[PDB]
Amino acid sequence: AVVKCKPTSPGRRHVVKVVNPELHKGKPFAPLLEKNSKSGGRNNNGRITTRHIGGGHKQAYRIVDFKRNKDGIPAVVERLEYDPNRSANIALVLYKDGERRYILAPKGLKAGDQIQSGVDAAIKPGNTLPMRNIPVGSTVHNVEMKPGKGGQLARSAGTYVQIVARDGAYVTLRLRSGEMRKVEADCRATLGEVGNAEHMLRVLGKAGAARWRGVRPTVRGTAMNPVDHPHGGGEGRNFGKHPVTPWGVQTKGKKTRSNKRTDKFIVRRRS
Amino acid sequence: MIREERLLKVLRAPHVSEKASTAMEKSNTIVLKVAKDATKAEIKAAVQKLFEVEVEVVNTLVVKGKVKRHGQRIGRRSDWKKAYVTLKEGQNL
Amino acid sequence: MKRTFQPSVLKRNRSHGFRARMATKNGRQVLARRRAKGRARLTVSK
RNA sequence: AGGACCGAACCGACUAAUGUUGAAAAAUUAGCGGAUGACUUGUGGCUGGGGGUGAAAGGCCAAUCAAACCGGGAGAUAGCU
RNA sequence: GCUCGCCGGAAGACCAAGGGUUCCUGUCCAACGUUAAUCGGGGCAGGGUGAGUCGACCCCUAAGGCGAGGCCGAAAGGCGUAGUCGAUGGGAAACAGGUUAAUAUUCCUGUACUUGGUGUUACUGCGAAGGGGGGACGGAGAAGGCUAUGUUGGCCGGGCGACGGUUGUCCCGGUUUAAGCGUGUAGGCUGGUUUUCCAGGCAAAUCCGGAAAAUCAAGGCUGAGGCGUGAUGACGAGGCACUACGGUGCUGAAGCAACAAAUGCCCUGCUUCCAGGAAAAGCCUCUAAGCAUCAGGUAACAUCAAAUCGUACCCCAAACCGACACAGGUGGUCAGGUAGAGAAUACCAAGGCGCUUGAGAGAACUCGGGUGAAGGAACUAGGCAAAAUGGUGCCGUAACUUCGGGAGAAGGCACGCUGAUAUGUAGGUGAGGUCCCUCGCGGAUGGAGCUGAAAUCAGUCGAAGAUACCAGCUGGCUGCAACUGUUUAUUAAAAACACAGCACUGUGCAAACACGAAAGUGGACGUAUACGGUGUGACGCCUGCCCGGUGCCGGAAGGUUAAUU
Ligand SMILES: [Mg+2]
Ligand SMILES: [Mg+2]
Ligand SMILES: [Mg+2]
Ligand SMILES: [Mg+2]
Ligand SMILES: [Mg+2]
Ligand SMILES: [Mg+2]
Ligand SMILES: [Mg+2]
Ligand SMILES: [Mg+2]
Ligand SMILES: [Mg+2]
Ligand SMILES: [Mg+2]
Ligand SMILES: [Mg+2]
Ligand SMILES: [Mg+2]
Ligand SMILES: [Mg+2]
Ligand SMILES: [Mg+2]
Ligand SMILES: [Mg+2]
Ligand SMILES: [Mg+2]
Ligand SMILES: [Mg+2]
Ligand SMILES: [Mg+2]
Ligand SMILES: [Mg+2]
Ligand SMILES: [Mg+2]
Ligand SMILES: [Mg+2]
Ligand SMILES: [Mg+2]
Ligand SMILES: [Mg+2]
Ligand SMILES: [Mg+2]
Ligand SMILES: [Mg+2]
Ligand SMILES: [Mg+2]
Ligand SMILES: [Mg+2]
Ligand SMILES: [Mg+2]
Ligand SMILES: [Mg+2]
Ligand SMILES: [Mg+2]
Ligand SMILES: [Mg+2]
Ligand SMILES: [Mg+2]
Ligand SMILES: [Mg+2]
Ligand SMILES: [Mg+2]
Ligand SMILES: [Mg+2]
Ligand SMILES: [Mg+2]
Ligand SMILES: [Mg+2]
Ligand SMILES: [Mg+2]
Ligand SMILES: [Mg+2]
Ligand SMILES: [Mg+2]
Ligand SMILES: [Mg+2]
Ligand SMILES: [Mg+2]
Ligand SMILES: [Mg+2]
Ligand SMILES: [Mg+2]
Ligand SMILES: [Mg+2]
Ligand SMILES: [Mg+2]
Ligand SMILES: [Mg+2]
Ligand SMILES: [Mg+2]
Ligand SMILES: [Mg+2]
Ligand SMILES: [Mg+2]
Ligand SMILES: [Mg+2]
Ligand SMILES: [Mg+2]
Ligand SMILES: [Mg+2]
Ligand SMILES: [Mg+2]
Ligand SMILES: [Mg+2]
Ligand SMILES: [Mg+2]
Ligand SMILES: [Mg+2]
Ligand SMILES: [Mg+2]
């Protein structure tokens, strides 16, 4: 459902929108809602620590079940919903014992579908199982890193993880980045891909669209004075230097990962 | 039961003026100078017991003292409390 | 035009008031200095 | 429907004249731009000086800014007047 | 006092902030007021601010602040849990009339309403730091139903006109009424009820959520306005009598309808879109520990209480911010008439002002404007400035184009008044009357009365009918930037910055990175369709060769190489 706006105005000419008629047009499930006020990139010292954040639409936080630890009880998908906090869509599910929860909506999951989590659940999209119980070569999403901690990998719209091999108490996984990573075989994964894969086909069309999402403008370092960026200065457009961050670190190709604690779980880097 | 001493403290002076006199003739109200911390109940009880009169309601306001000048020197008069207390058409204090 | 001083009692009290001075040792040093000088008015509170 | 169009409030500040010991330490008059938006505005809050903030002009941070203001080192030093 | 002029979406009225006696009265004119001053926001003295219902206080929380223990840090301190504060937001209740020199929803008169404590009666399962419900929420858009309000008619009171006419199809004025209570209407939402069960709501729940039955077919909640009452009252033009000439007192007619109509109400509604739209308490409901012929709750009545603080006055300003009685700045509400699309604009109403030096004269020159023979950009760096265009309806409109635009392209025609169409039309509103029923704020019909565009034909006046105020100059070639935005507060608004888009690069989550000696925090309650950095800058067609130098990435055979030994 990718549709382009007619050029009735200069700010509409290039707009491409993704609209899902399958989504709920009403209000979200109130008992699973929380407030999340905005930070503007400021930390508890009040200083800007991440640039280019501010403004944007008010959002309510939807408590989403990333653990899926309620094993044994089946559930039905009531509807699909828009989530402002993330790219992917979320689904409201009703457990047969009378409990309602939000889950990430995987690709192909519509109203009426049944889901189940546990060691003894069927291998079908939406169901969560320990990767010890999932056939090798399965497309999964919402992958746990530590058992019982909740899904942390492949959560954005359209993403998944490939279960490449299983030897010992460990499974080899291929991540969206191309990295090959070993994780413990007791970590749960949900079958299938994350839905809303057309999310990347959108074209914002105008500056105001980026402002609505809370992104503030980026000023090129080469356009400022030398006192406040390494790239600054010159009479006319001049560069004559190797590109760096505002803090002087070379910013085209220099590697920054330094974590010896988790080096043992990486099979190959994304390259 | 507000004590005898407090009742004897809370009344200071009648308020003499044209508006007070008119309140007396028209609405059967006496206007009093009372203590700054004196409450409506204390004023009512003191008026009833020392004036030997029956009271139905007490209205209170605080007067802000005036800033005047005594020979190039700044000087301010004190705040005070004034009470509009109504008598019930039978006592005529 | 819009000048620099836009009065507000609440903001003045919170920024320069007695409680605000007493809340940090530097503010208490301000009070100590102003008492040692002999100021008739220590703060903006009054 | 629209960072859509004309146009008041409102926000601004392109031209000209006046004023330049001003009515005003930045305005007035006639025109001028935006005017449902990246809009505007009230109240309160947070970020502190080699620091902040900056759709970036070295702009702004109380008529002060290529390093605020106040006090102190302090009677800095001055082959200069 | 009588004339004149000005504002009237304010130059009127009222809140908030800010100020603090500037408010009212008597007295005085030294100093202050850009002059005089008998006057004043000046001096001096007195007076003036009345609340259960307005606000604060109070209960509840947002951002944020503080923070027992705690974690961290040479010290000073930093951060933060349980908590506790913090409105700009949520939470009970009052209206109309009258009165002062100065207060009034506070005082008086009349009519109301809220909350709680005590006593009793009757009935009875009550009980929270806990569960559930609710409070509770966006932008835009569209009707429909109303009201504030206005106009006209009717009614009542008065008038008969300084100069031709004016007993009428004439002139002037008035024609007002609340909260509350009763009614539950236009409309909005939702299918109800009694059963039986259950991996859920941290345990319990009879409450909420889920599963199934049978029955019923209309129940429930919400809601402007209207009407009745409130009100045989109050108010009321005017009239009679004084007046200390400021004003005081008594009396008191009509007090109806039709039509028009909001940006206000129903509406926290409905339709729709994506950027997906606070919290907590009050409130309702459910049980646990536990009390249980007591407590405790429900309903009816009686009684008591609702403290304290603010309340004057200015508030687009001479009282606030600007050193000034300073052409500046200052958030919200109110919103009449004619014309008009209009909160533009012109003249007016209510109301408020003539801006704290005047009097003459009628030179140059300066400032702000009007008009101009013939010419018409010859001016000048440059058409700077000025002049000009300017409305509605209809007709018509090119290259180019991303097919939306270009476009109001260009250019043209009509425009006042009167009569007829039509004693006022198309349309709108709509009383009676009749008919019907689950009876009412009900439906069908009926159309009196009221209101009422635009068009046509014919005449008619002027030089001129969008006559004033108001209100696009237009076209042709070209550089730059795609565009809307932003910027050097106070000589630069631009071709500069940003931008949607593109690319390189880093980053596997205790992410990279940033702020922090640290604890922590942001990134992000995000997870590579993500986040940071860098350069370029919509879109179209595209983006060639060089890795010698410098940087970055990968490799470790050999050489050199620190502390150490
Ligand atoms: Mg960024
Ligand atoms: Mg960018
Ligand atoms: Mg520059
Ligand atoms: Mg540098
Ligand atoms: Mg150059
Ligand atoms: Mg070069
Ligand atoms: Mg009273
Ligand atoms: Mg009071
Ligand atoms: Mg626009
Ligand atoms: Mg425009
Ligand atoms: Mg500006
Ligand atoms: Mg102007
Ligand atoms: Mg405009
Ligand atoms: Mg400055
Ligand atoms: Mg320096
Ligand atoms: Mg020294
Ligand atoms: Mg010296
Ligand atoms: Mg020398
Ligand atoms: Mg006028
Ligand atoms: Mg005075
Ligand atoms: Mg006065
Ligand atoms: Mg004088
Ligand atoms: Mg005076
Ligand atoms: Mg401690
Ligand atoms: Mg703290
Ligand atoms: Mg807190
Ligand atoms: Mg509190
Ligand atoms: Mg408040
Ligand atoms: Mg008054
Ligand atoms: Mg009406
Ligand atoms: Mg409007
Ligand atoms: Mg008042
Ligand atoms: Mg000044
Ligand atoms: Mg003056
Ligand atoms: Mg002024
Ligand atoms: Mg303003
Ligand atoms: Mg006007
Ligand atoms: Mg002259
Ligand atoms: Mg002239
Ligand atoms: Mg002229
Ligand atoms: Mg002439
Ligand atoms: Mg001529
Ligand atoms: Mg001529
Ligand atoms: Mg000519
Ligand atoms: Mg020429
Ligand atoms: Mg020439
Ligand atoms: Mg020449
Ligand atoms: Mg010009
Ligand atoms: Mg002109
Ligand atoms: Mg005609
Ligand atoms: Mg050229
Ligand atoms: Mg541009
Ligand atoms: Mg522009
Ligand atoms: Mg400038
Ligand atoms: Mg400029
Ligand atoms: Mg972290
Ligand atoms: Mg560029
Ligand atoms: Mg370019």
Side-chain angles (χ1 to χ4, degrees):
Chain A
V2 60
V3 65
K4 66 184 289 184
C5 300
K6 284 191 178 177
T8 48
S9 56
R12 287 291 279 208
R13 176 183 305 273
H14 300 292
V15 170
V16 168
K17 67 215 294 197
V18 163
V19 285
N20 199 359
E22 177 144 32
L23 293 186
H24 185 61
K25 285 175 151 100
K27 298 293 183 182
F29 196 47
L32 286 180
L33 271 168
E34 297 186 346
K35 73 182 268 280
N36 59 332
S37 296
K38 321 171 313 187
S39 73
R42 274 89 167 160
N43 80 338
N44 58 354
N45 295 335
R47 301 273 189 91
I48 291 163
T49 71
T50 300
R51 294 182 315 167
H52 312 105
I53 299 180
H57 209 293
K58 195 177 187 181
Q59 297 160 343
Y61 182 69
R62 277 77 162 155
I63 296 150
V64 173
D65 182 18
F66 288 115
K67 281 182 199 285
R68 303 280 304 282
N69 54 14
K70 185 176 180 180
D71 293 342
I73 302 101
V76 71
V77 174
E78 300 217 88
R79 71 206 191 207
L80 273 59
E81 290 199 0
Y82 178 85
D83 197 349
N85 296 282
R86 71 193 71 258
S87 47
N89 299 312
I90 62 180
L92 186 81
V93 297
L94 169 66
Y95 284 101
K96 293 181 176 66
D97 68 335
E99 190 190 13
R100 280 190 176 85
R101 287 178 186 191
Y102 277 129
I103 59 157
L104 297 176
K107 178 182 165 63
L109 188 68
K110 46 201 162 53
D113 285 2
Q114 304 284 309
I115 56 164
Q116 188 148 23
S117 70
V119 305
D120 56 304
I123 297 89
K124 65 190 189 260
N127 280 6
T128 304
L129 283 72
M131 291 185 275
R132 183 176 295 283
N133 279 303
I134 299 169
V136 167
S138 296
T139 285
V140 293
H141 71 269
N142 199 38
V143 185
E144 276 177 352
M145 297 193 96
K146 288 189 181 69
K149 193 181 182 187
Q152 285 184 294
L153 317 177
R155 284 155 39 144
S156 292
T159 52
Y160 57 92
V161 169
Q162 183 62 255
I163 305 180
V164 186
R166 176 184 301 125
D167 48 344
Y170 280 95
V171 287
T172 308
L173 302 185
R174 179 181 291 124
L175 309 185
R176 280 299 302 188
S177 63
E179 201 199 66
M180 299 261 291
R181 191 200 172 81
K182 283 165 54 172
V183 70
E184 270 150 23
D186 296 297
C187 299
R188 285 161 182 271
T190 314
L191 266 296
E193 314 192 337
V194 183
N196 196 24
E198 75 278 6
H199 157 80
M200 49 174 179
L201 288 170
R202 65 159 84 259
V203 177
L204 282 183
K206 55 173 193 153
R211 300 301 302 274
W212 300 336
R213 283 144 168 97
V215 181
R216 295 202 81 241
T218 296
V219 179
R220 297 161 301 114
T222 197
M224 64 184 73
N225 296 113
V227 59
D228 50 59
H229 198 284
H231 296 179
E235 285 290 83
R237 304 194 180 109
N238 287 335
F239 209 66
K241 66 193 73 80
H242 299 114
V244 297
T245 70
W247 301 276
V249 182
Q250 189 275 331
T251 193
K252 296 289 180 68
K254 184 172 198 305
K255 297 186 191 331
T256 52
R257 166 195 177 84
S258 48
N259 179 300
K260 281 187 229 208
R261 185 170 50 80
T262 76
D263 268 8
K264 65 178 72 66
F265 304 111
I266 311 297
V267 189
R268 292 183 291 113
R269 296 293 287 168
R270 58 186 206 287
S271 85
Chain B
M1 197 150 78
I2 297 169
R3 294 179 66 188
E4 193 82 43
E5 293 179 353
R6 176 62 174 172
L7 292 189
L8 287 157
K9 300 295 187 291
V10 294
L11 292 187
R12 306 312 305 188
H15 189 52
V16 182
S17 85
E18 189 276 331
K19 182 182 175 146
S21 312
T22 300
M24 186 66 204
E25 290 100 12
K26 182 191 287 283
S27 198
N28 189 359
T29 292
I30 58 173
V31 192
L32 294 161
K33 294 181 176 67
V34 307
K36 170 83 158 310
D37 56 298
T39 72
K40 281 168 175 167
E42 293 179 353
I43 295 155
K44 175 172 181 171
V47 164
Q48 283 209 155
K49 185 176 180 180
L50 307 175
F51 297 144
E52 274 292 351
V53 167
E54 286 290 86
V55 182
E56 78 172 359
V57 67
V58 173
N59 283 319
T60 59
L61 67 90
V62 183
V63 188
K64 317 309 180 294
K66 276 177 181 177
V67 164
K68 293 182 183 293
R69 197 162 289 104
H70 177 284
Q72 190 163 350
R73 261 198 276 265
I74 203 72
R76 190 175 183 271
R77 287 160 188 207
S78 293
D79 292 331
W80 59 286
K81 196 178 269 290
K82 157 158 80 189
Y84 288 102
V85 55
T86 312
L87 315 185
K88 48 177 73 163
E89 68 246 38
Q91 287 87 31
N92 308 119
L93 168 55
Chain C
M1 284 73 74
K2 181 180 199 185
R3 294 307 169 195
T4 50
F5 181 51
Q6 303 306 318
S8 158
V9 172
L10 187 52
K11 273 168 82 161
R12 176 172 197 78
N13 278 334
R14 288 176 172 185
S15 280
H16 317 290
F18 186 90
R19 304 278 291 162
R21 299 279 188 224
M22 283 299 290
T24 57
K25 65 90 176 179
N26 283 322
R28 303 199 283 281
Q29 309 280 15
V30 176
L31 288 199
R33 282 195 311 265
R34 290 182 72 83
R35 274 192 194 108
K37 205 173 178 195
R39 290 285 192 175
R41 283 82 58 85
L42 291 180
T43 75
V44 306
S45 288
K46 182 61 71 166

